[PDB]
């Protein structure tokens, strides 16, 4: 293997895709960034450690630019009005086999499949109702 | 429309699909659990709060159980041998359009798509390298 | 260029080979872990530090698990029944050129070469005689 | 039958080979030393002891000299300009069968096999990267 | 792509080129050293940290040794008679585009181009006048 | 000699070059500035002093304008969002001959040659990986 490669983060179907590429590995934290200024980039980081004697935790973070009315390459302040931050922590018991970890991945991607309630609440700027 | 519906969390291709259904909304936390005893159930919860004045924060959690049957006092009880915990917080600026929010949802599902680096690492009990 | 990669810790033929893959490099400690349950995994770590003004000191550690299943109360968990622990410290003065380091490496692999006294004493639960 | 014998610590070709020959086995410590001046000699020792009720612990040590001549007051002495010191401790539970010991030995020699990350970091005055 | 590769630090036109190669990344500091003993090696290190909220700061260091062979205790050791130290810190706003960053790199190499004032002064043990 | 002249700081190959010209020499600190307002100028300064009894230090500073979305001659605030700052300190032992200083200059320009890792990390808005 060799996991640390470029991948498509936003698939707008071929044209307008956002690819994110390896950009830092200081401290064994893999970072991927898109081709933009660091203030407007899509950024992804991932690391894993044994959190307790019984568990490992993957910590995954994503930053996504507010794009409507963006000025590309512009200085946009305040930073917080222009960025969304995702923070995932996955705690997996040391007993989990690879098959177990496959299922955890499937649960994670089921949660976010189109049409399911959580992605469609987020995208519609809504809560659950 | 009411987006509080049942959905399939783990798609094992029609056979042994784990599907999760609305089960509680007390205290503004939407909860979905699978059709098991509460001791062995998959659980998904979601809540949105306006965290800052200019942010909203979604908090989503998933529990994946490893089911087992334990003998306690000479009696067999349905139990989960361990659970894995996904815990994610998403902070979105209030200035984000629905098209901006769709970008976040697309980035989150691209992150976990089959074959991209992070799902591969998790599924292999590996780190990124 | 990278030497933090996957490698074969045990060529046990060309099939039952044990491979260890990069897992974490926090705080200057490179760690590699084999796949499947962390509870039954082989682990290797390595770190180098300037122990004195004139010396650098590598600390390398390897753990070899005896794979087993713990069954308690009817619940079975994949565990390591026990682990052997190798721990080695190699001190090298800053005056060593690369050729001197190659020789140190050849001494290390000669020490453990198949058929020589130390590897064959260990392999047979035995001391020197 | 004896494993306290001479052996090749460095096959540096088939000519500049460094051989270590039995020197002393006092107090359960087997010692081997290469020929010519003890001051420039390679040294290997090995001892095994029941560290705990359940464990035996091997302690192996190797010293690699940098050969040199000290000249003081016109008197020259064959000396070691400096020495690298390898020191390793291997703990094995009394439950290990001979096959488990063979595997422990294969893990040790895989760790140091030519081309793998640890031997090639050492060989190049380098850490992991 | 992995930009952590070997490069030639001092180009003496093919003959006596000093070339430096990846040697450590512990603690997020990429290190390159030349192929000498650690006592006589050229060393280059580089690290990036997000210094402010709106800045990132690169810290690059270079050590150029003047090699020598010293007699200590009647024994000759490979040594550096002195080292010269380049130490540079670059602070870049997060709003800088990759085209903005290319401008910085072009300015830094124009600064040291052969024949411009600063390289000439350094090379002549002169100040600017 | 007479080092203090105009030179090309950014060579965009004839057309679009940035020339920086002598602009101040108060306190023996040579300053060069481009033809712009002081808030948008490329600025270079250089000075040398004996830092210790054994060393001299050249202190070189460069300021580079953020140019993407720049308004030429405009008032752009905050200043820190619109400027990058380079700071180099070169410490050279008083024993270094001119030949030694030539080599230090070559090491400095090798570090920054196109294609080598440090300039290409900077230009790609990246760390080392």
Curated annotation (Swiss-Prot), chains A, B, C, D, E, F:
Changing residue 45 to A: Loss of repression of replicase translation. 80% loss of binding to the operator RNA in vivo. The keyword NAD does not apply. Residues 31-104 are annotated as: Viral RNA-binding. GO terms for biological process: negative regulation of viral translation; regulation of translation. Keywords: Capsid protein, RNA-binding, T=3 icosahedral capsid protein, Translation regulation, Virion. Gene3D superfamilies: MS2 Viral Coat Protein. InterPro entries: Levivir_coat (IPR002703), Phage_RNA-type_capsid (IPR015954). It is found in: Virion. GO terms for cellular component: T=3 icosahedral viral capsid. It holds the Pfam family Levi_coat. GO terms for molecular function: identical protein binding; RNA binding; structural molecule activity. Homodimer. The capsid proteins form dimers that assemble by group of 5. Twelve such pentamers are linked together with free dimers. The homodimers binds to the viral RNA via an operator hairpin, but also to many other RNA sequences in the viral genome; this interaction probably shifts the virus from the replicative to the assembly phase and ensures specific encapsidation of the viral genome. Belongs to the Leviviricetes capsid protein family. Capsid protein self-assembles to form an icosahedral capsid with a T=3 symmetry, about 26 nm in diameter, and consisting of 89 capsid proteins dimers (178 capsid proteins). Involved in viral genome encapsidation through the interaction between a capsid protein dimer and the multiple packaging signals present in the RNA genome. The capsid also contains 1 copy of the A2 maturation protein. Acts as a translational repressor of viral replicase synthesis late in infection. This latter function is the result of capsid protein interaction with an RNA hairpin which contains the replicase ribosome-binding site. This is Capsid protein. It comes from Escherichia phage MS2 (Bacteriophage MS2).
């Amino acid at each position: 293997a060799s996991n640390f490669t470029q991948f498509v983060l936003v698939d707008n179907g071929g044209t307008g895709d956002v690819t994110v590429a390896p950009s830092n590995f200081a401290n064994g934290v893999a970072e991927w960034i898109s081709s933009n200024s660091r203030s407007q980039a899509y950024k992804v980081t991932c690391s894993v450690r044994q959190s307790s004697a019984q568990n490992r935790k993957y910590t995954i973070k994503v930053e996504v630019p507010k794009v409507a009315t963006q000025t590309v390459g512009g200085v946009e302040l305040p930073v917080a009005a222009w960025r969304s931050y995702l923070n995932m922590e996955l705690t997996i018991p040391i007993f989990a086999t690879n098959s177990d970890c496959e299922l955890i991945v499937k649960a994670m991607q089921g949660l976010l499949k189109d049409g399911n309630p959580i992605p469609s609440a987020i995208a519609a700027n809504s809560g659950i109702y």
